[PDB]
Amino acid sequence: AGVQCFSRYPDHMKQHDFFKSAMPEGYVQERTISFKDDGNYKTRAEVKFEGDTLVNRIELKGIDFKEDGNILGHKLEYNYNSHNVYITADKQKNGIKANFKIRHNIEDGSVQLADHYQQNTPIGDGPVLLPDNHYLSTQSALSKDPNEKRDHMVLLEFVTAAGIT
Amino acid sequence: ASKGEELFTGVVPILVELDGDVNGHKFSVSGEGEGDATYGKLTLKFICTTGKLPVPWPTLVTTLG
Ligand SMILES: [Mg+2]
Numbered sequence: 001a002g003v004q005c006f007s008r009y010p011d012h013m014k015q016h017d018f019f020k021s022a023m024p025e026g027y028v029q030e031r032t033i034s035f036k037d038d039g040n041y042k043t044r045a046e047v048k049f050e051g052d053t054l055v056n057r058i059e060l061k062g063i064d065f066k067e068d069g070n071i072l073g074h075k076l077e078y079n080y081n082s083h084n085v086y087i088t089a090d091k092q093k094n095g096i097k098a099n100f101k102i103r104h105n106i107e108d109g110s111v112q113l114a115d116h117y118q119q120n121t122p123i124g125d126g127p128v129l130l131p132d133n134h135y136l137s138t139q140s141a142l143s144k145d146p147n148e149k150r151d152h153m154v155l156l157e158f159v160t161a162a163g164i165t
Numbered sequence: 166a167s168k169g170e171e172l173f174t175g176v177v178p179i180l181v182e183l184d185g186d187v188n189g190h191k192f193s194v195s196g197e198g199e200g201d202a203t204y205g206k207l208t209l210k211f212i213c214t215t216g217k218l219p220v221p222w223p224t225l226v227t228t229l230g
Contacts, residue, residue: 008203061186
């Protein structure tokens with residue numbers, strides 16, 4: 001969910017795709033990710049084109065984590081549950097907001113909730129598309145490269161916009 | 166659709182760069198891959214360039230992915 005400009009918007013919803021409308025100048029994306037009974041991430045990112053390449057540059061700050069919580073204690077399974085991202089316009093910032101819940105699987109069979117609140121605003125001056133309410137349906141598959149000795153993650157994701165007929 | 170949508174009709178290369186600080190544990194991640202919005206499809210590989218990531222990879226997917 002860092003480069004939501006790669007979502008598939010169905011043709012009948014294309015007037016609701018803020019993310020691509022902000023390109024190439026791009027958008028700022030900010031989140032607060034609150035891990036239930038643990039700490040939080042605050043993130044600020046700028047997503048924009050640099051020539052023909054889509055670039056996502058992020059600063060992440062995490063505070064108030066428990067030293068042997070699920071996060072700093074590495075108690076989460078290496079997998080990822082499908083979910084929806086619920087988008088609404090923020091006319092006042094000429095942008096969008098989103099809210100959604102991520103449920104990480106704990107190795108003991110339980111779940112670690114990560115509440116997400118998100119705000120996006122354009123970097124450029126050109127007109128953008130302010131959407132009606134809708135959601136992004138996301139699926140992500142996490143894997144490893146068997147020849148990579150560095151700490152890493154291989155990700156395959158599919159995302160489709162939905163919720164308007 | 167918008168003018169910007171025209172930039173996404175084919176495969177677009179992606180670069181991701183993250184600097185992080187979680188409870189004082191500092192780290193950086195670099196990612197590379199490509200997106201094909203026609204199919205809603207993203208393929209990315211991330212490397213922690215500072216050593217061991219001090220948080221689980223899944224907790225960064227919404228930020229990095
Ligand atoms: Mg309407």
